[PDB]
Amino acid sequence: WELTILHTNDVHSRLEQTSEDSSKCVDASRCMGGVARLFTKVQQIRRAEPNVLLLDAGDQYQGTIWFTVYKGAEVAHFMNALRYDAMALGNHEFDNGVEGLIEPLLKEAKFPILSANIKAKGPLASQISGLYLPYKVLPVGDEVVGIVGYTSKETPFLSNPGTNLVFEDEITALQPEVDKLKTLNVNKIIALGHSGFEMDKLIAQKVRGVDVVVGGHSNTFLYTGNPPSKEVPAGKYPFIVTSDDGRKVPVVQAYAFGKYLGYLKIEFDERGNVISSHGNPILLDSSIPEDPSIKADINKWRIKLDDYSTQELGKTIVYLDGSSQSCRFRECNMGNLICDAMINNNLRHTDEMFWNHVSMCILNGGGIRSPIDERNDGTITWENLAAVLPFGGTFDLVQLKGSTLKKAFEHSVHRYGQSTGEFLQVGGIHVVYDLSRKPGDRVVKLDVLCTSCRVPSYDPLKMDEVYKVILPNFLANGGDGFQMIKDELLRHDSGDQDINVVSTYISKMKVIYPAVEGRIKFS
Amino acid sequence: WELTILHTNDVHSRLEQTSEDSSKCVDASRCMGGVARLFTKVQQIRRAEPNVLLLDAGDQYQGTIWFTVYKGAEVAHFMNALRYDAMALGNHEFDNGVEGLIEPLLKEAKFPILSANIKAKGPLASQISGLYLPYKVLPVGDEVVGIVGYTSKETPFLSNPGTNLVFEDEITALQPEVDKLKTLNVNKIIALGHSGFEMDKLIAQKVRGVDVVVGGHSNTFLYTGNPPSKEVPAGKYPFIVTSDDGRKVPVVQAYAFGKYLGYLKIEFDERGNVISSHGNPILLDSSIPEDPSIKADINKWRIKLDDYSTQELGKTIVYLDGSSQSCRFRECNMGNLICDAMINNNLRHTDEMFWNHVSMCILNGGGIRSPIDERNDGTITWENLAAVLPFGGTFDLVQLKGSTLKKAFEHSVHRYGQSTGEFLQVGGIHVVYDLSRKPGDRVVKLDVLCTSCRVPSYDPLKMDEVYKVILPNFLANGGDGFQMIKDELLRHDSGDQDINVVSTYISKMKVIYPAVEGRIKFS
Ligand SMILES: Cn1c(=O)n([C@@H]2O[C@H](COP(=O)(O)CP(=O)(O)O)[C@@H](O)[C@H]2O)cc/c1=N\OCc1ccc(Cl)cc1
Ligand SMILES: Cn1c(=O)n([C@@H]2O[C@H](COP(=O)(O)CP(=O)(O)O)[C@@H](O)[C@H]2O)cc/c1=N\OCc1ccc(Cl)cc1
Ligand SMILES: [Ca+2]
Ligand SMILES: [Ca+2]
Ligand SMILES: [Zn+2]
Ligand SMILES: [Zn+2]
Ligand SMILES: [Zn+2]
Ligand SMILES: [Zn+2]
Secondary structure (H helix, E strand, C coil): CEEEEEECCCCCCCCCCCCCCECCCCCCCHHHHCHHHHHHHHHHHHHHCEEEEEEEEECCCCCCCHHHHHHCCCHHHHHCCCCEEEEECHHHHHHHCCCHHHHHHHHCHHHHHHHCEEEEEHHHHHHHCHHHHHHEEEEECCEEEEEEEEEECCCCCCCCCCCCEEEECHHHHHHHHHHHHCCCCCCEEEEECCHHHHHHHHHHCCCCCCEECCCCCCCCCCCCCCCCHHHHHHCCCEEEEEECCCCCEEEEEECCCCCCEEEEEECCCCCCCCEEEEEECCEEEHHHHHHEEEEEEHHHHHHHHHHCCCCCEEEEECCCCCCCHHCCCCCHHHHHHHHHHHHCCCCCCCCCCCCCCCCEEEEEEEHHCEEECCCCCEEEHHHHHHHHCCCHHHHHHHHEEEHHHHHHHHHCCCCCCCCCCCEEEEEHHHHHHEECCCCCCCCEEEECCCCCCCCCCCECCCCEEEEEEEEEEEHHHHHHHHHHHHHHHEEEEEEEEHHHHHHHHHHHHHHECCCCCCCCEEE | CEEEEECCCCCCCCCCCEEECECCCHHHCCCCCHEEEEEHHHHHHHCCCCCCEEEECCCCCCCCCCHHHCHHHHHHHHHHHHHCCCEEECCHHHHHCCHHHHHHHHCCCCCEEEEEEEECCCCCHHEEEEEEEEEEEEEEEEEEECCCCCCCCHHHCCCCCCEEEECCCCCHHHHHHHHHHHHCCCCCCCEEEECCHHHHHHHHHHCCCCCCCCCCCCCCCCCCCCCCCCCCCCCCCCCEECCCCEEEEEECCCCCCCCCEEEEEEEEEECCEEEEEECEEECCCCCCCCHHHHHHHHHHHHHHHHHHHHCCEECCCECCCCHHHHCCCCCCCCHHHHHHHHHHHHCCCCCCCCCCCCEEEEEEHHCCCCCECCCCEEEEEHHHHHHHHCCEEEEEEEEEEEHHHHHHHHCCCCCCCCCCCCCCEEECCCEEEEECCCCCCCEEEEEEEEECCCCCCCCCCCCCCEEEEEHHHHHCCCHHHHHHHHHHHCCEEEEEHHHHHHHHHHHHHCCCCCCCCEEEEEC
């Protein structure tokens, strides 16, 4: 019996086709992804293969102005149009709190939404009961397939789920659900979830009864053969894990941003044992036409986005200096604004040991692409912010040792004076450079804002201590020569869209007035 | 023909009786003012004197939780109960914008509200037309008296009137209105307004046809004889000005906070010439009973205030360190919070030459009377803020030369180490002390945030430059040994209530997290 699993993960609001690097589509003849093109390919496969499941491993929420305006209604609408068979909750599905998940996604999706390791307490337990499920048994041809969900146990640090949801250890929660499915004579089981490739391999190894793991969160690209685009594979597709009971369990993921459609064919025997599996993610490039009906519906929904983009978000009473002459040479108030917005975006519920789990921000000055003039009655619109932050990136959370952060600050000024992009704007850090010193030894003072403290204050950076830092995905990936960040980081989780982080902060503040205040000094 | 003018000014929300220093009444047997006691005295005078006018010279708005909750409805209600005959607009009547004045005061007052020097433009001109008047002619016995209003031309820097109101020069605007009254055979004219004692003397001198000036704003106490309480008179009551045409024009004011009722008897001849005048403000002490009906109505309205005082205003995720061990010895995050709230409260409409007219704050650490613990789910209520700021003061705007501010910072640490109240918390200032230096020479660096700049940044304090600073009225009055502030200041305007400034800022922010960030350093 052959099952074809089609899968997406970390689509992150890429409803429209994007450029090759998942930013705004500018050269239509070379654009990729989008739900209209995904619809064409899914429909084609469903005409040819008898047993198909289309699954999403979470993180449809967050990524573009579509999510900013429609707040998940676009996810329910377009996932319903594609006829997804099941979806697991991702961390970003909690960005607008549990209410922003219940309404509109859980109440409007025409497919089960799953997570076996999220437990509710208090009145929320009654409000949400049955709106998401630990698993669903689906009929596929003349057989049934059980799909069990899971979501990152770290979601409380990576989104806004509130204090009435408990995120349990994935393996601990999954095992009893898989054993329950076995008692109900369900012999084909898919674990679909959102914890990252490392956890997916552990689930494949340790959760007895799981036949295949379909994952997400880490934006992992897996491929068997020569890669079709710029993404470098982390391993073969599927990635085979040997389970504790000796079975070979395929693990799949399909990068992010709707650029690829995962495709895995699994051959099962009559007892649900996996005989073999093969496949590869399909690059959704311009060789696949965008479905005209879906494309026309996307164009209709785009009107409200164009209208929103010109509305006032808030006001500034100061000139927002995002010039290269300032932001690539010294502390600039646009850099302070964006770092303050990044820290505000990352305020999460913590225990009594931290005021907040993260207090620090770094931002390459070359990533700030325009100033914003305050003389248009102080108005700031999304279009203005898009000129400052045009790359379509995210502001991510990483864990870096102090030694790595000291190397990053040395890199920030290693060739100072040429208007190069690596000069860092900061938040929660006070740095002093002495440019008369040799490159690599110019950082003379580096103080950081504490997190494990009830009163935030600055203390010297410690080389062996691991710090949480918010920074662009461009830097987390080693952009601008920050290879030490990519190579030495101890954890990396994708954050919210860059423009959205700043837009939300400006709207909350109503009137902003960022100052240059001594975060970066020269001796 | 004898006219008795009863007058109040700068009542500033003191609806209830207060202590002798106009703070919360604690020893009822020695409390003063309040509208219930004012009603008793006004009613008594109106039984005895045939020709009485009860006038208010503005600034009923702002000062206590009454204004915070009722937003001017309490002013219309209780001024109507007292049967005020006329009121001039004060600067604080614009604290909640022109909408917060129109509704509820202008639409609900049963007496004319006046100002001849405020002109509206755009659609507001039609919306507000006739809701306030340049003057009113009132019948008094068998005669008529014209009352012409005026309001501080500096109101755009001292409140939130918006950009659709123009505040003209008082004398320029008043003169044509007084000459118009003379054409209508009104020969007895009172100028009632809110610009301060200095401007009141200029109006008495230069506006031809004005028989008496009844003022406010500067909280001026005038008295003829031995003063009845702790207020020190600035001059006799009335203060006589010789007009340009040789007449003697009495000028009156009655301190502030409803502690006194101004009382002036004027003898006019048949042609409206002033023959003589005499009087004195009446101290509203415990020898005058509170009117039982007004007192019962005040007690009924107080219920909503008690309810509000326990509601959540916002949350803190950090411990708000308002301890004396911190705030009298070093930078404390409660001090940073309050100074940031003071600066946010003073954001006003400026020309293209300033991002804001004021950027600096000083606050005596001894004025911070409690910390606020963040472990009650982060909740902050008005009752918590009242424990931090219990004195019932205001956060005022002053103009100080840099030399005066350097002397204030030397005074801040002149006897450092004894937990004395004069140690300053700051905003928009970065100070460095070297305590090994002799007292009076411990300030080694003092940088201030620019105002006449599009990008706020810090520059060294200049001894000859005049800076605007927000600080408690306690310090503006030379409290805590800051005699140099009282003696050397170049301008002083009373600001908003201390608790209200902080409460509004916390509600706007929703979640606060003030840090200790290096505003005060020790070498
Ligand atoms: C995020 N990012 C970035 O910050 N930068 C910053 O620009 C700087 C280069 O700018 P430049 O010196 O002004 C000359 P340009 O490359 O703009 O021609 C870099 O140093 C770096 O700081 C560059 C690339 C970049 N991402 O590359 C992917 C990408 C490119 C274009 C678009 Cl529209 C969307 C995604
Ligand atoms: C505003 N203010 C103030 O900050 N202080 C600060 O307290 C300090 C004295 O406090 P302490 O060392 O704790 C001994 P205490 O006088 O509380 O017994 C002063 O140095 C100064 O910084 C003092 C008086 C004061 N205003 O005096 C008028 C007033 C007094 C009491 C009440 Cl409830 C209402 C209005
Ligand atoms: Ca099986
Ligand atoms: Ca006259
Ligand atoms: Zn994701
Ligand atoms: Zn994720
Ligand atoms: Zn006043
Ligand atoms: Zn005033």
